[PDB]
Design a protein around this motif. Structure first.
Motif, PDB file in Angstrom:
ATOM      1  N   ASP B 161       0.813  -1.217   0.000  1.00  0.00           N
ATOM      2  CA  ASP B 161       0.000   0.000   0.000  1.00  0.00           C
ATOM      3  C   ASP B 161       0.847   1.268   0.000  1.00  0.00           C
ATOM      4  N   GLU B 162       0.170   2.415   0.065  1.00  0.00           N
ATOM      5  CA  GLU B 162       0.830   3.716   0.034  1.00  0.00           C
ATOM      6  C   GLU B 162       1.790   3.976   1.185  1.00  0.00           C
ATOM      7  N   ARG B 165       5.072   1.594  -0.671  1.00  0.00           N
ATOM      8  CA  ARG B 165       4.872   0.988  -1.971  1.00  0.00           C
ATOM      9  C   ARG B 165       5.917  -0.035  -2.355  1.00  0.00           C
ATOM     10  N   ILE B 302       4.516  -4.424  -8.221  1.00  0.00           N
ATOM     11  CA  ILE B 302       3.769  -3.514  -9.086  1.00  0.00           C
ATOM     12  C   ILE B 302       3.280  -2.385  -8.170  1.00  0.00           C
ATOM     13  N   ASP B 303       4.151  -1.410  -7.916  1.00  0.00           N
ATOM     14  CA  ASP B 303       3.851  -0.301  -7.002  1.00  0.00           C
ATOM     15  C   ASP B 303       2.847   0.774  -7.392  1.00  0.00           C
ATOM     16  N   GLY B 304       2.701   1.034  -8.683  1.00  0.00           N
ATOM     17  CA  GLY B 304       1.777   2.066  -9.114  1.00  0.00           C
ATOM     18  C   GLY B 304       2.536   3.294  -9.589  1.00  0.00           C
ATOM     19  N   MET B 305       3.824   3.360  -9.252  1.00  0.00           N
ATOM     20  CA  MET B 305       4.681   4.475  -9.643  1.00  0.00           C
ATOM     21  C   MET B 305       5.721   4.032 -10.670  1.00  0.00           C
ATOM     22  N   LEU B 307       6.130   0.782 -11.847  1.00  0.00           N
ATOM     23  CA  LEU B 307       5.469  -0.160 -12.749  1.00  0.00           C
ATOM     24  C   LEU B 307       3.966  -0.078 -12.553  1.00  0.00           C
ATOM     25  N   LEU B 308       3.253   0.458 -13.537  1.00  0.00           N
ATOM     26  CA  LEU B 308       1.809   0.599 -13.416  1.00  0.00           C
ATOM     27  C   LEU B 308       1.035  -0.711 -13.501  1.00  0.00           C
TER      28      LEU B 308
END
Ligand SMILES: CC/C(=C(\c1ccccc1)c1ccc(OCCN(C)C)cc1)c1ccccc1
Ligand SMILES: CC/C(=C(\c1ccccc1)c1ccc(OCCN(C)C)cc1)c1ccccc1
Ligand SMILES: CC/C(=C(\c1ccccc1)c1ccc(OCCN(C)C)cc1)c1ccccc1
Ligand SMILES: CC/C(=C(\c1ccccc1)c1ccc(OCCN(C)C)cc1)c1ccccc1
Ligand SMILES: CC/C(=C(\c1ccccc1)c1ccc(OCCN(C)C)cc1)c1ccccc1
Ligand SMILES: CC/C(=C(\c1ccccc1)c1ccc(OCCN(C)C)cc1)c1ccccc1
Ligand SMILES: CC(=O)N[C@H]1[C@H]([C@H](O)[C@H](O)CO)O[C@@](O)(C(=O)O)C[C@@H]1O
Ligand SMILES: CC(=O)N[C@H]1[C@H]([C@H](O)[C@H](O)CO)O[C@@](O)(C(=O)O)C[C@@H]1O
Ligand SMILES: CC(=O)N[C@H]1[C@H]([C@H](O)[C@H](O)CO)O[C@@](O)(C(=O)O)C[C@@H]1O
Ligand SMILES: *[C@@H]1O[C@H](CO)[C@@H](O)[C@H](O)[C@H]1NC(C)=O
Ligand SMILES: *[C@@H]1O[C@H](CO)[C@@H](O)[C@H](O)[C@H]1NC(C)=O
Ligand SMILES: *[C@H]1O[C@H](CO)[C@@H](O)[C@H](O)[C@H]1NC(C)=O
Lengths: 532, 531, 532
Positions: B161-162, B165, B302-305, B307-308
């Motif tokens: 999570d945030e 990450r 797959i962190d969101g930053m 690697l989307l």
């Protein structure tokens, strides 16, 4: 069906659909939505900050932890107040700035249902939002129910009296949650333009404080204080708070060289170290041996200079603040059991006498703040009747319930009325079948009793008489109507006179009918007594 | 006459070093900081710009390698070092540094192609000081940069999570590249012609950067050696929370919430986390327990930053930054080095269908083959000769293919179909610098090309004239790629582009082109996995 | 009537009115106004930050703590220098960035009196602002007197030689206070346009440093260094400081892997832990056994790149910096008693001889920095006269007072003069009646002896002869006039020749009359000796 996935500002949140007996539309329930950044590390004793935005889909499907508080007192209060079947065992953590949402709206379409934000109580020392289930209220009156949490005890109210740690962290946390509501609730089928806050006890006081606070302006449109207002002395510390700060600092093993030193030292302590100090401070219990004027029952509100620019009393003087439809109520017997019990009052004998009374009333100084000199005159105006000890002791409890909630609530209602704002009052006189076994069967309208009607306990719990089920249905209708129009009235419900100069209020219970001048005689008496 | 370059954050002093038979001495700068030490609260957070200094910082000492098992770290350093003496290193959370080797005459303007090397070590061990750039720099005339990034828990700890990450390590990597853009010009390098290349995990990192939005525009040519973003062991797909909680509990922390875990770990001392790192028993093949629970290590997520979405999904849409990309593997990845380190049961030097199928299962973390398909795979490979020792080897090829073989080729293809210049190679040679303990039947063992690529023959001793030449060739090839995005050039064999014919280059004693590398295996596994 | 309440940028400040014998207008005294945010936690070893603005009325009415230091050495110096009746016992704390104000102005009206900022001394290791009382100076010469504090010891001067901890925190702390004066002093009837800074000893050196620093530009308009300048070796570390950093780190129980690792490791240490290391490091004491070249007497100013772009020597070469009226002075016998006493000098025989001398001078390397080869040539130029041992000692002590303050002060004066800026020199030769008993009546003008005249000790203490009372009246007029016009002169006072090419200075004391070429012969001698 399929898990609900709302889209908030900081990212997508996933919930769970739950159906209530005899209700087509399932209610969307999201448990544990963060409304701020965890107040850990250096953020302790500082205002709450905006929560970090997440990347994928956050699963709001577990009951968030309850802020650090004595784990026994906490779990206990959770059981005695919970409106649900099973009491959910909770966890402790500084990481507790979360809120739960219960929305009856069909999220697949636009919806702007009135929002109701519930601020739990617990003397600002204990409590949790997860205790109160919104399924029922949300289903039955079609309003989005939001339950918020806020820093308690040391974590949420430690104040040094100066800029190094002003205090009211908890109330700020509260204000924070309301800002979150304004900027997000719309995505859960709720009308950010029609928010109504309502709390019980310390929660009710919070509501009364927000109504007075400049920061809270425009974050709600209707307020409801149940068994607690900003004039309930025990919850508001007026005077030099430095001494208490210093005591706490010392108890935790800190130097007290300066304010900045104390705050710092404390930020270094581990949560357990601080939870341990709390226990040592011996809050929430009546000190029977020691100067009653030194005993500190809790860490409450203070006049920080940000949330409260001055004592509630001075503030309500000038009607020049934000005035909104405000419903202020109290219960028939606030000090009937639950409190004199949790605090451990010397009343196992079940009887009292002038002498013992006056002594108690004195040792109860922190709760009522009556000067040792006036003790005699007060103990009399109430116990001077029947010589029956058991009656004197029952009158003794009324004596306190009046100084703590009775008069205060009425005085606040009046000033709000004279401010030019829609005001209503009520007095709940009923004994829920959900009471504890240990609570005498004669004690009716005890502290927190209305909670079961307000949160529809009869429809989630078991064994409600057909009479009680009706009482709940009515109270919710009444509450929800207020939330909607700043007026409890509506067809199918008794008439609720507005609290104007006639001072009409509503007696609620088996027999629901209006009346007038609630506690009028008492407000008059105490007002002078205190005038010295 | 010490070199004194001027960077954005301040002046840096280095040291001149001459190489045998080269007039111009190469300017060497060891330990330039490209980010603020990720100490204290900065742990588990993205790297921050380094503090600018006032006078002349002495970049003249090998920086510390990020905290990691000092034994596994130092050992790998020796087995991969291209220099004479292995340099013993120091451990520290303060490790975000990079070393520079520029062959340019700093007294004049120079814009030589830049080559940034991302060492490997399973995202757990390794250092940038291990690899010396003196040779590659002088010989092909390119500026060589070796970077370091946070490893193990420090660089890949994720709560899903945030609150944490993850991919701190890769973020540090991108950090270094940003640094190069704003500074490498002051070392005779062309910021507009940066080429990144890594080996093993580094090879994977390079592959990840090619898929990452954040890496866009920081490099212009990429090279992945023995490792890509499809090397499953290095990429964590699925709920990572569980692993977080395990780590947190190991280090002696509450797991109440995510925030709580991150916070409690931030409080732990380096020794405390290094101690936990050992306890976690990463890098060691667990032979007793459910193979689906053993966590080989902490990897990319797959962190969101950074690697989307999963590498697989990403490479589906050719809509990202496409650049010349060289992807290669070695003849025998799992031939010795990897199995030896993780301590494998092949002390018998032979295997059999039963034993194999068991190993393959206990190697689940490495290959990720379902217990049902195990039988079907163990056969397609060991089903031939009844010779156990042949199965013992066919077994090793089996792993080498699922881990690097097929993955590399699949990545090469998608890049090719993305419309970008793609090249593949297969290194088959046994460096004279191999360990003694290394059997002389292994040719193309994991990380064997490194000696050729970093000109080990010109820094070490005893290189046969045949080896010297293999090295001279590889570098030429690499450098040309860094220069034009095409390895070809005069004086070199022909390297066919990796297009539809799927031509690649077999490198070694006999260097000649070929086609459809591992083609048969890509097809096989692809379906087996399709179940 | 009661309490003064000034309004500053960060909020209102409440003080206390104090009247002085024979003075109508009472002086407004504010004790403990914060000029920077407490440098606790991560802020340690970092520049000082603006102070957090407060909400109501801060009570500036208690002496602020003195920065962490040697409580013994600290309180002792406090006593030996305090100009007031009773020595005020102080407290220790990292939270110490405070300043005290003494304004004789009638705050009910606008007033722009010259401001005099005092930077106390103490070898940058000890000292505090509360020691010096400004009541007298403020009243008698009608100037707003401000006493500041700044981080000392490790807390204020720890340096790693690199950007991970540049150093001079203490000097940045000083600059911060001056910025505060610019943005606030006007509210205490002070003229932010006419600020004068003056310090004694380490405070004198600091003043000399701000005169060379770019960061101090425009924060003052007149400077005064008393017994200490930027050329007083012992206070300025030239060369690789990394070694010392590492020793300190090791002593405190830290890894020395890298600079950043050391700074971080130290930030984690508690105050007590650091105070404990300060003690172990045996500072402020003369090491008689070990290489005199390794002995580190204290942590001082360094060439950081922010406050000081280069060595003071180099800097003063180019007159291209901010030049202002500068008064530089020294005392007849700087090394007469106080320091050799505190540092524990072996001179318990009250006599010396060529051999013993040369050994001491050597072991006093940190203090003077004389190479072992030149020791013989210096020991001679001074002790070569009379064979009287007791004279050799007296001469030996002069030897030191000249290298540490004598020459340095004069060299700084000359360069400032040749820069084109108004310059004045003075030599104080008097033995205050407030001296310590333990101080031999022979010694006159010991280190810090002018302090008593400068701060009007005769008007707050007891037993001042009519001769001493006058000396003080004169010194303050002189100092105050300077603060006013950048020229001590005025009617009713002796003439003070400017320090030009004639190099005229002023001998002060029982007999106050001008003279010329102060220490001229010594400046010349040591200049070459050091040129080797
Ligand atoms: C705002 C009234 C209140 C309450 C209260 C709040 C909401 C519902 C019921 C009671 C209270 C009292 C004692 C307590 O725990 C005692 C520990 N024992 C179990 C040993 C927990 C809560 C209070 C009154 C005076 C001082 C402090 C708090
Ligand atoms: C004043 C009314 C009362 C109380 C009471 C005390 C404090 C607050 C509120 C109510 C009571 C209830 C139970 C009890 O003890 C149970 C045995 N356990 C302690 C083991 C002792 C006292 C009472 C009722 C009926 C008969 C006698 C007394
Ligand atoms: C990415 C392949 C890799 C490697 C590796 C990376 C680059 C070059 C050579 C080997 C590895 C294996 C074992 C090891 O240490 C064992 C020390 N003690 C624990 C015994 C350290 C690294 C790896 C394979 C499976 C799981 C985890 C990492
Ligand atoms: C599959 C490659 C391998 C290995 C090996 C397997 C896994 C990791 C590392 C090395 C090997 C080599 C020597 C050995 O023991 C020597 C001591 N005495 C028993 C002689 C035990 C195993 C091997 C090489 C040549 C022939 C047969 C097997
Ligand atoms: C810059 C002159 C100075 C002074 C000093 C500063 C102002 C006024 C008077 C004296 C000093 C000397 C010793 C001392 O404490 C010894 C404690 N022991 C008794 C344990 C405290 C201060 C000094 C000289 C050399 C090295 C370090 C500092
Ligand atoms: C340099 C001035 C000095 C000092 C002194 C030494 C170090 C630091 C500061 C001062 C002195 C004072 C008293 C003494 O002994 C007394 C024992 N009694 C039994 C006599 C020994 C030395 C001195 C004063 C007068 C005569 C001779 C020397
Ligand atoms: C940590 C945990 O196990 N609880 C759940 C939390 C909780 O909602 C908050 O900690 C308090 O509500 O949120 C998740 O669902 C989520 O963000 O995906 C993760 C997890 O399932
Ligand atoms: C051990 C170590 O690496 N630290 C060294 C740093 C390096 O510049 C950086 O760490 C990168 O090498 O600074 C020095 O070289 C220097 O300027 O005197 C000395 C110091 O020991
Ligand atoms: C902790 C303490 O007792 N000191 C005092 C501090 C001071 O600011 C400084 O600490 C020193 O004067 O805070 C007050 O002034 C204040 O603003 O109310 C009152 C307090 O008495
Ligand atoms: C969130 O809830 C959904 C239920 O639909 C589940 O699929 C998902 O795995 C949950 N998140 C995690 C990883 O715990
Ligand atoms: C500040 O001073 C006033 C008068 O001296 C006093 O009434 C007030 O209590 C003081 N504030 C503090 C420190 O409590
Ligand atoms: C470079 O300069 C530093 C100081 O500026 C010096 O101490 C060092 O010895 C030099 N480099 C090295 C360590 O060889």
């Amino acid at each position: 069906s399929s898990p609900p996935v709302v889209d908030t500002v900081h990212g997508k949140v996933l919930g769970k659909f739950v159906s209530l007996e005899g209700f087509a539309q399932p209610v969307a329930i999201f448990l544990g939505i963060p409304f701020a950044k965890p107040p850990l590390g250096p953020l302790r004793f500082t205002p709450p900050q905006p929560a970090e935005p997440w990347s994928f889909v956050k699963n709001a499907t577990s009951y968030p932890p309850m802020c650090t508080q004595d784990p026994k007192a906490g779990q206990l209060l959770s059981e005695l107040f919970t409106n649900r079947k099973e009491n959910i065992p909770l966890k402790l953590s500084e990481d507790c700035l979360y809120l739960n949402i219960y929305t009856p709206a069909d999220l697949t379409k636009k919806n702007r249902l009135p929002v109701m934000v519930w601020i739990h109580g617990g003397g600002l020392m204990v409590g949790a939002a997860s205790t109160y289930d919104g399924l029922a209220l949300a289903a039955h009156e079609n309003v989005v129910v939001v339950t918020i949490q806020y820093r308690l005890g040391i974590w949420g109210f430690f104040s040094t009296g100066d800029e190094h740690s002003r205090g009211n962290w908890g109330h700020l946390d509260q204000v924070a949650a309301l800002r979150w509501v304004q900027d997000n609730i719309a995505s859960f089928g709720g009308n950010p333009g029609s928010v109504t806050i309502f709390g019980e006890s310390a929660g009710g006081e919070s509501v009364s404080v927000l109504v007075l606070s400049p920061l809270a302006k425009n974050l709600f449109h209707r307020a409801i204080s149940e068994s607690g207002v900003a004039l309930t002395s025990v919850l508001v510390k007026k005077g030099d708070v430095k001494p208490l700060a210093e005591q706490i600092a010392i108890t935790a093993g800190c130097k007290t060289t300066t304010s900045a030193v104390m705050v710092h030292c404390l930020r270094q302590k581990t949560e357990e170290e601080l939870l341990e100090t709390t226990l040592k401070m011996k809050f929430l219990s009546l000190d029977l041996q020691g100067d009653p004027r030194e005993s500190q029952p809790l860490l409450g509100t203070v006049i920080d200079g940000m949330l409260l620019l001055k004592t509630p009393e001075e503030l309500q003087a000038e009607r020049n603040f934000h005035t909104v439809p405000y419903m202020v109520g109290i219960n028939k017997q606030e000090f009937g059991w639950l409190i004199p019990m949790l605090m451990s009052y010397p009343l196992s004998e079940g009887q009292l006498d002038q002498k013992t009374a006056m002594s108690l009333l004195w040792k109860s100084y922190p709760l009522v703040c009556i000067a040792k000199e006036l003790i005699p005159e007060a103990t009399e105006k109430y116990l001077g009747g029947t010589d029956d000890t058991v009656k004197k002791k029952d009158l003794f409890l009324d004596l306190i319930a009046d100084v703590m909630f009775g008069v205060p609530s009425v005085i606040v209602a009046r000033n709000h009325r004279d401010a030019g704002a829609p005001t209503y009052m009520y007095e709940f006189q009923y004994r829920p079948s959900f009471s504890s076994d240990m609570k005498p069967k004669t004690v009716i309208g005890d502290h927190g009793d209305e909670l079961f009607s307000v949160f529809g306990a009869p429809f989630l719990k078991e064994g409600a008489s057909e009479e009680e089920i009706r009482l709940s249905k009515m109270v919710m209708k009444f509450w929800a109507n207020f939330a909607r129009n700043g007026n409890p009235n509506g067809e199918g419900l008794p008439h609720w006179p507005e609290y104007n100069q006639k001072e009409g209020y509503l007696q609620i219970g088996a027999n629901t009918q209006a009346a007038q001048k609630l506690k009028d005689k008492e407000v008059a008496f105490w007002t002078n007594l205190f005038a010295k």
